Amino acid sequence: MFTGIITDIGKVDRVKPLNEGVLLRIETAYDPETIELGASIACSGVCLTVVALPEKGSNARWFEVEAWEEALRLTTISSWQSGRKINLERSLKLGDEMGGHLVFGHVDGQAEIVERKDEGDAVRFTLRAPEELAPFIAQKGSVALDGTSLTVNGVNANEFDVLLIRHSLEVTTWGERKAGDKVNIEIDQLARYAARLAQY
Template sequence: MFTGIVEELGQVESLIEDGSDSAVLKIRGPLVTSDARHGDSISVNGVCLTVIDNVDGVFTADVMGETLRRSSLGALEVGSQVNLERAAALGSRLGGHLVQGHVDGVARIVAREPAADWEVVRFSLPAELAKYVVEKGSITVDGVSLTVMAVDDETFSVGMIPTTSKLTVLGAKDVGDPVNLEVDVIAKYVEKMLGDRHV
């Protein structure tokens, strides 16, 4: 479980696809690897990956083909920057919201509208996720916990403060770039519990 508060920008050291529907990813992240052990979870652009090993500030993770297809990790290259967050510890502050690191879909940046002290960023909204996204609700974009400012059937917007722009990959992404989305898991549980009942 994560909070959507990015701890550091990491860098892809290598991405090896061996042709067997999987890949091995090596990422440099001195902060998140400072106490990382085999089996620990680290969120990489919002995708929960398991640490295989950790050597000199670089951790290795196996990535299944399913993950490569259903997230933007398959588009990473050597040198790409990525958002990194260690799993939340029980008893620590929850600065963002409950994030599982399970990507629900990939969106693209539709527009960026700079303002004096912040920026409005608009993203495409996959049709199958639209019912889970509400104004003032939480959403995770590339592992970053954000609040939805506005939403329609095809897009949603967030307000991005300078800190988010400077300390996450979202600040460097351009219109058309892909991003990983994770909707609020509570909405999915409520839907499952209610089933076909109408309120």
């Protein structure tokens, strides 16, 4: 589990093909001495488990993860190539506060940025989400876009807007986002359960 508070901008070093999957090497500012093997890291909102770390003595700062069929089909990982900057977040530690938005790294699909407009030192992004996600939006709660916890402001069916503040643009990949870009979308976990309960 995560909080959607991005702590690093990672970089895709290499993409290696696996049997119906990809091996991703991600460059990070995180100390590999603080990353245990098997740790869960949210990579642009995708929960992935660390499978390899640099050799003892090596000055390299990377971690390796494996993205399989569900992650490839639904997430932006399908388009990831060497040089791609990605949002990073470490798992929530027992004792730390949960905050206003829990993020599990279970992305529903890809939302598309249709408009980017500057509003002072902040940037308003207008997005379109897959049709099936529309009833979860309009509820105007919090959403995880590329692993970033964001408040849903205006809504028109499957179209919605988010306001990215100066700090968020600086410390996340949102500073380089533009119209046409695909982002990972994760609907609020409690809202998922509430909607599933409503079916019965």
